[PDB]
Amino acid sequence: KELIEYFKSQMKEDPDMASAVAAIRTLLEFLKRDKGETIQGLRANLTSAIETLCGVDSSVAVSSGGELFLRFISLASLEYSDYSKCKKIMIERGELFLRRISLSRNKIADLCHTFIKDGATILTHAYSRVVLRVLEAAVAAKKRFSVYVTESQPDLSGKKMAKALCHLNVPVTVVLDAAVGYIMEKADLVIVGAEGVVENGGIINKIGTNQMAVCAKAQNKPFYVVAESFKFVRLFPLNQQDVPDKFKYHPWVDYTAPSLITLLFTDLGVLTPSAVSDELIKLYL
Amino acid sequence: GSELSERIESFVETLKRGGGPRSSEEMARETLGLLRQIITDHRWSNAGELMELIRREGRRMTAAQPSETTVGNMVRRVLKIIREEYGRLHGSLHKLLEDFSFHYAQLQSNIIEAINELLVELEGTMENIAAQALEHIDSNEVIMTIGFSRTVEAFLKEAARKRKFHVIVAECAPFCQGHEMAVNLSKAGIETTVMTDAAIFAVMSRVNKVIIGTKTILANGALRAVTGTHTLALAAKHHSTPLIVCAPMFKLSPQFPNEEDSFHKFVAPEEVLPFTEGDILEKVSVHCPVFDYVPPELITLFISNIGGNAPSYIYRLMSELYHPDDHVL
Amino acid sequence: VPTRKDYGSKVSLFSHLPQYSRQNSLTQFMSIPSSVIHPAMVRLGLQYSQGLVSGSNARCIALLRALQQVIQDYTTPPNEELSRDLVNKLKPYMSFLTQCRPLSASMHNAIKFLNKEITSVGSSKREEEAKSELRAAIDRYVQEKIVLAAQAISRFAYQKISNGDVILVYGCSSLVSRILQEAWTEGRRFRVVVVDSRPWLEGRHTLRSLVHAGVPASYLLIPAASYVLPEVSKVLLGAHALLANGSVMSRVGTAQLALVARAHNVPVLVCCETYKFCERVQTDAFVSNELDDPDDLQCKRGEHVALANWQNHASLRLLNLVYDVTPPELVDLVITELGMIPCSSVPVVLRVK
Numbered sequence: 001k002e003l004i005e006y007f008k009s010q011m012k013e014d015p016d017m018a019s020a021v022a023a024i025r026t027l028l029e030f031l032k033r034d035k036g037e038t039i040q041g042l043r044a045n046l047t048s049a050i051e052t053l054c055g056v057d058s059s060v061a062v063s064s065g066g067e068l069f070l071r072f073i074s075l076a077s078l079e080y081s082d083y084s085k086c087k088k089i090m091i092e093r094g095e096l097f098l099r100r101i102s103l104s105r106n107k108i109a110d111l112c113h114t115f116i117k118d119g120a121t122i123l124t125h126a127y128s129r130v131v132l133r134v135l136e137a138a139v140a141a142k143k144r145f146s147v148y149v150t151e152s153q154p155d156l157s158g159k160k161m162a163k164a165l166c167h168l169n170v171p172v173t174v175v176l177d178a179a180v181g182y183i184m185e186k187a188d189l190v191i192v193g194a195e196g197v198v199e200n201g202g203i204i205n206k207i208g209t210n211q212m213a214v215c216a217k218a219q220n221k222p223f224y225v226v227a228e229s230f231k232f233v234r235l236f237p238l239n240q241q242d243v244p245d246k247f248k249y250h251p252w253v254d255y256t257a258p259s260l261i262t263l264l265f266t267d268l269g270v271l272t273p274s275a276v277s278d279e280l281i282k283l284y285l
Numbered sequence: 286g287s288e289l290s291e292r293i294e295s296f297v298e299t300l301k302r303g304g305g306p307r308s309s310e311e312m313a314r315e316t317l318g319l320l321r322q323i324i325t326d327h328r329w330s331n332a333g334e335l336m337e338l339i340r341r342e343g344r345r346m347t348a349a350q351p352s353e354t355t356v357g358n359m360v361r362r363v364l365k366i367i368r369e370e371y372g373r374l375h376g377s378l379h380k381l382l383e384d385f386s387f388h389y390a391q392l393q394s395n396i397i398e399a400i401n402e403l404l405v406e407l408e409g410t411m412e413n414i415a416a417q418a419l420e421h422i423d424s425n426e427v428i429m430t431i432g433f434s435r436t437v438e439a440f441l442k443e444a445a446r447k448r449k450f451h452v453i454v455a456e457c458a459p460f461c462q463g464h465e466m467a468v469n470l471s472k473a474g475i476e477t478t479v480m481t482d483a484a485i486f487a488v489m490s491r492v493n494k495v496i497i498g499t500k501t502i503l504a505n506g507a508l509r510a511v512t513g514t515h516t517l518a519l520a521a522k523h524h525s526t527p528l529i530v531c532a533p534m535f536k537l538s539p540q541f542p543n544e545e546d547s548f549h550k551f552v553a554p555e556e557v558l559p560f561t562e563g564d565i566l567e568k569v570s571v572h573c574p575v576f577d578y579v580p581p582e583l584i585t586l587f588i589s590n591i592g593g594n595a596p597s598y599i600y601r602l603m604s605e606l607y608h609p610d611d612h613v614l
Numbered sequence: 615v616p617t618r619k620d621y622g623s624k625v626s627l628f629s630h631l632p633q634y635s636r637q638n639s640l641t642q643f644m645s646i647p648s649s650v651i652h653p654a655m656v657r658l659g660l661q662y663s664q665g666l667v668s669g670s671n672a673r674c675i676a677l678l679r680a681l682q683q684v685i686q687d688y689t690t691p692p693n694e695e696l697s698r699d700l701v702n703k704l705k706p707y708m709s710f711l712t713q714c715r716p717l718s719a720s721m722h723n724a725i726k727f728l729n730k731e732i733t734s735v736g737s738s739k740r741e742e743e744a745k746s747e748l749r750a751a752i753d754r755y756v757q758e759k760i761v762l763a764a765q766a767i768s769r770f771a772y773q774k775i776s777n778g779d780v781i782l783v784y785g786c787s788s789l790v791s792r793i794l795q796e797a798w799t800e801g802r803r804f805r806v807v808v809v810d811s812r813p814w815l816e817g818r819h820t821l822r823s824l825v826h827a828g829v830p831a832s833y834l835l836i837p838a839a840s841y842v843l844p845e846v847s848k849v850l851l852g853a854h855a856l857l858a859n860g861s862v863m864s865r866v867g868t869a870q871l872a873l874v875a876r877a878h879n880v881p882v883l884v885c886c887e888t889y890k891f892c893e894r895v896q897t898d899a900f901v902s903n904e905l906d907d908p909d910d911l912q913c914k915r916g917e918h919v920a921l922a923n924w925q926n927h928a929s930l931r932l933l934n935l936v937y938d939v940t941p942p943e944l945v946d947l948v949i950t951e952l953g954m955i956p957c958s959s960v961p962v963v964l965r966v967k
Contacts, residue, residue: 278962
């Protein structure tokens with residue numbers, strides 16, 4: 001088809017860009033193709049596309065972006081119940097939404113880079129563009145710090161993060177996945193990216209994040225999390241088993257409770273683990 | 286007129302040199318009166334010029350004393366009032382899925398009316414907070430406090446007329462201000478006791494409740510209290526005892542623990558180590574922090590003029606009080 | 615109507631709460647055709663005192679039906695508006711009901727809503743129309759906040775219950791029983807563990823209801839909860855009220871159960887309606903609680919009662935607590951008709967209503 005190809009094309013011009021933003025761009029672009037003038041036909045065709053896209057890419061971010069797009073179309077449906085000017089106004093609002101989501105990363109970096117002090121040691125788990133941007137803005141602010149990255153045994157992405165950080169002239173250091181407890185005392189704060197924010201405040205991240213959060217809680221170490229707004233998902237896992245199996249697939253993801261998180265840096269502002277629930281309730285997604 | 290300028294300069298100088306109004310209520314009242322005066326006798330037509338003028342003056346007042354956040358709170362409150370009144374006369378995730386150059390006529394009068402309403406509410410906050418004393422205090426109860434706070438003093442002495450309890454007061458080492466509070470409480474027959482900070486944990490096994498006052502409330506529900514409150518909260522959390530904070534709405538600042546080192550106010554070491562020690566003062570490094578940081582996780586409840594609430598809802602009060610664009614000021 | 619006299623010696627820590635006896639009722643000093651108090655309110659107070667209606671929603675439903683009857687039977691006097699007359703006339707009835715038995719949070723919220731609605735009636739509208747509108751508002755409120763809210767909470771909790779689960783319930787709550795019965799009828803295959811406590815022994819109600827429904831159930835007392843939790847997979851609890859600080863006010867044996875559950879690493883869930891969300895705050899059960907009849911502590915063990923005559927000993931006290939409060943740090947999820955929300959989102963829902 002065209003959905004698969006367009007998704008892969010948007011993923012390929014810029015590797016940097018996340019999967020959910022690319023999926024939202026593909027959905028809005030396919031919205032221009034729509035010929036049916038009935039609302040359930042538009043709804044079902046687009047929902048089919050979002051499920052197929054989610055099948056292609058097993059990630060929580062893609063599903064979150066799809067859920068947000070359907071909720072935004074439902075609001076634009078409660079506009080007038082028209083689907084005559086509704087498609088037009090919806091396209092404009094969607095373009096505005098895309099431009100706004102583009103600046104999310106810069107807003108998160110400019111808001112989170114202030115919590116890093118000169119001479120402090122940072123502890124990161126895996127590669128993430130958001131934490132990389134935060135660190136680049138901190139070093140851009142005439143700051144000096146040391147970073148410890150976990151190798152991320154499932155896929156050697158921690159080494160990629162360390163390479164991209166050492167390229168910015170920062171004394172990075174790679175540690176073993178089993179050494180997260182040995183270097184926890186030599187870290188002043190922990191900053192990691194989140195793949196998806198659950199209803200209560202927890203985060204769905206790489207398999208090696210919950211144990212690090214546990215060690216941080218055991219040593220009173222600030223555990224900060226950086227994530228965008230399009231990663232908010234209406235899930236409520238009670239333990240490591242309540243997480244959907246489609247997101248885990250040696251699992252590739254785990255859930256972290258909000259009691260182990262100190263603060264959250266999102267494009268909407270710096271928030272606590274409980275404010276995200278209020279935001280999700282306000283959206284009624 | 287230059288009288289406004291003379292008043293602004295005097296206010297900035299008195300805040301930067303030493304402390305001004307002793308009570309926080311008087312500080313907020315003085316700030317609100319100065320803001321109302323700046324609004325009344327000044328050349329402003331549009332909302333943007335007035336807001337920028339207030340922003341520059343408030344920035345100056347805050348730079349004069351950064352630990353005095355009650356003034357930044359009043360400036361931000363006045364800014365929010367101006368924005369709301371301008372939107373009333375001119376016309377998140379759910380939201381996401383502005384010029385101030387129009388010049389009206391009755392904007393100044395209603396701004397002043399709103400400021401007077403805020404003043405009357407500021408005046409009534411003390412009784413509104415003190416009225417909730419019997420809901421948390423019981424007979425033959427033991428209460429522990431630290432320092433000297435008018436809000437906590439009223440909260441405690443308002444329930445002594447109908448309940449009988451034992452109050453423990455821990456003095457502050459740099460400025461022993463708890464003695465005055467203990468004396469004022471004993472003057473009303475509450476069976477008060479005075480002690481040092483070193484015996485906080487040693488005596489915190491027979492305590493049943495803790496009620497304290499703060500200087501400002503941060504955004505994530507943490508406090509900037511006098512030195513010694515962090516240890517009190519730690520002891521409370523170790524013994525799983527509720528820690529109540531009686532603070533009005535004007536003690537709420539829209540900032541998270543972003544900053545570093547300039548959080549606490551450092552005064553001369555004369556209070557900690559006297560000047561008559563000898564030559565060891567050239568080698569010994571003495572530090573005297575007045576305030577400290579108390580995380581939100583160690584707090585249990587916040588008794589305000591609009592009723593008690595949990596720290597996990599203070600963010601909403603922030604969204605309700607201040608505008609996100611006026612956080613930096 | 616005279617004061618409801620107390621019974622027995624109260625405890626030193628609960629010396630500010632009333633302590634009554636079920637044998638001595640307050641309807642003894644009243645006229646047989648009740649003149650000052652409405653007959654419906656008299657019967658309701660008698661049922662509350664005798665323990666015939668024991669439950670948060672059963673009490674609220676009975677109170678609302680009695681109020682409907684009173685409004686149907688009440689005619690407004692002349693030279694006065696009805697909007698204030700009905701509130702002033704209902705005040706002593708509420709006083710009498712409180713004298714019979716302390717009111718619950720559900721009853722308080724219902725009375726507040728009814729007073730607001732009565733005050734909202736205009737002075738120009740007629741009497742029959744206003745009475746009909748009040749009766750209809752009462753019925754729609756019951757339908758929306760009790761029956762439809764219970765269906766929405768059961769529909770939301772059905773996804774949390776899975777096959778092979780071991781759910782642990784406590785006390786008697788109609789919402790939990792309905793949730794379990796609907797999950798069992800929808801095809802889920804699990805087993806419930808019923809925990810009970812003295813002296814009410816109301817868990818047997820849910821036990822028999824589940825046996826009648828066909829769900830495999832177990833029964834045991836609360837001191838042995840630490841023995842059955844290792845095999846328990848979920849803990850479903852009912853709540854009578856949710857304070858503004860997120861703390862859960864429910865039956866006395868809930869906070870201890872939640873504490874033991876967290877120690878055994880078992881996720882705890884709470885089911886409550888939005889009309890039971892109280893705006894007040896409390897940190898522990900000492901400053902505000904309810905002391906039931908102390909003679910319920912007496913037990914026939916062996917051939918003699920050790921507490922047969924407890925009042926002879928002036929040093930012996932009998933404490934019979936009813937409600938208790940749980941901190942938000944021991945509650946994992948809260949189920950409501952709005953959706954599954956954490957416990958630290960209780961004020962946000964209070965915001966929207």
